[PDB]
Write a protein that binds this ligand. Structure first.
Ligand SMILES: C[C@H](CCC(=O)NCCC[N+](C)(C)C[C@H](O)CS(=O)(=O)O)[C@H]1CC[C@H]2[C@@H]3[C@H](O)C[C@@H]4C[C@H](O)CC[C@]4(C)[C@H]3C[C@H](O)[C@]12C
Ligand code: 118
Length: 268
DNA sequence: GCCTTGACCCTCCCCTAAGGGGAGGGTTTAGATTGTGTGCAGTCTGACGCGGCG
DNA sequence: CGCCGCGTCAGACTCGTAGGAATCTAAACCCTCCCCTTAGGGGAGGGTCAAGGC
């Protein structure tokens, strides 16, 4: 049986048989020496059936080679099974994210706020945890901290890139009684003089949105991130962070400012 | 200023999985078939070499 | 060997623009080889950017 007849018996392409002969998965029963013509046999079909049976389970080709040439490989079927359930979990996550994306696109004609899930590494910060009378007043006590720390900690170099964020320890929304905590990432440890203390913040997987524009429409992004959290079955594991990437310090226009809100979450 | 130094940065080339697509090359093919197929040309005049007759 | 008619070969003005020539024609197989596909990774080779050190 030539390769054209075998490809019609097997209902597979000829190039598939060429590839399987090249890699050594399915070798023809007899190859004509002068022409090169591959000839196949029923005993090759009995093996192509096994190849197809394994390949329909999503096994990679090299896994199929290992399974059919070397027996007692029950660890490879377990690896493929665990990977299949992991991919199923990831696929359910992706499905929820794309359903949410369509309900939002069908909600507002322009999408102002995309949501991205990113992992934040561990870091060394100096932090001051304090009760703030108003969000407008929160901005006032930060530049005092910025000069005082550089005067009190000489040669202290902030990391690059600059991770300067806020920990919202409030489990509910309020305007005037915010128990907030100002953090700023630094390269190495230091002295803990004053109300400013040093600490490490654990690496977290967090869903983040970057808000461009003034600080009054941030409630939109928070409700959106909360909406994302309720829609996609995540649970808030830690306090939300507020990372100030660009602001009045690089650019004078207040509507081009940008900050990224991070929601530490786990899928539950 | 001349000279190193460590960190960055660029393009370019090759690699990934499982074949698809195509180019460019071989091979045979068993009713019987058995000799091509066009023109075209109104030149003249020298001049040379040769079959054939004497 | 000597001469006569026959076969053959070689020559024949310079400017612009138009300006070529146009028919006829396997198919089904197989092979190898080369490039292609994600979304980038890895490395070689070669440049470049601020630090300073004398
Ligand atoms: C969902 C979240 C708890 C979890 C609640 C509890 C504390 C709330 C923030 C603070 O109020 C400060 C600030 C007020 C602005 O007005 C809107 C933005 C800010 C960041 C709020 C957003 C959001 O509503 C927070 C994080
Ligand atoms: C210590 C030192 C600098 C800043 Sb800022 C800032 C950030 C958020 C809100 C208000 C101010 C900063 C600069 C670069 C990158 C990230 C943050 C800052 C710097 C100069 C002038 C005004 C503000 C804060 C603390």
């Amino acid at each position: 049986s030539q390769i054209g007849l075998f490809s019609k018996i097997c209902r597979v392409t000829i190039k598939t048989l060429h590839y399987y002969n090249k890699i050594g998965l399915l070798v023809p029963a007899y190859i004509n020496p002068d022409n090169g013509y591959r000839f196949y046999t029923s005993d090759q079909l009995m093996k192509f059936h096994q190849i197809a049976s394994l390949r329909q389970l999503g096994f990679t080709i090299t896994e199929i080679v290992t399974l059919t040439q070397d027996e007692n490989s029950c660890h490879i079927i377990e690896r493929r099974r665990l990977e299949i359930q992991k991919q199923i979990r990831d696929m359910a996550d992706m499905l929820s994210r794309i359903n949410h994306y369509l309900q939002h696109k069908k909600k507002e004609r322009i999408m102002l706020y995309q949501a991205a899930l990113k992992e934040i590494p561990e870091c060394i910060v100096y932090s001051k945890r304090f009760i703030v009378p108003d969000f407008s007043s929160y901005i006032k006590l930060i530049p005092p901290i910025g000069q005082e720390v550089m005067k009190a900690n000489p040669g202290l170099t902030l990391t690059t890139p600059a991770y300067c964020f806020t920990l919202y320890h409030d489990k509910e929304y309020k305007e005037k009684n915010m128990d907030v905590e100002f953090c700023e990432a630094v390269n190495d440890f230091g002295k803990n003089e004053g109300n400013i203390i040093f600490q490490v913040i654990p690496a977290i997987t967090a869903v983040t949105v970057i808000h461009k524009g003034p600080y009054d429409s941030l409630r939109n992004a928070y409700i959106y991130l909360m909406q994302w959290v309720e829609d996609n079955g995540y649970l808030l594991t830690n306090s939300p962070r507020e990372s100030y990437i660009d602001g009045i310090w690089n650019k004078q226009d207040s509507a081009e400012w940008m900050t990224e809100i991070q929601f530490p979450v786990e899928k539950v």
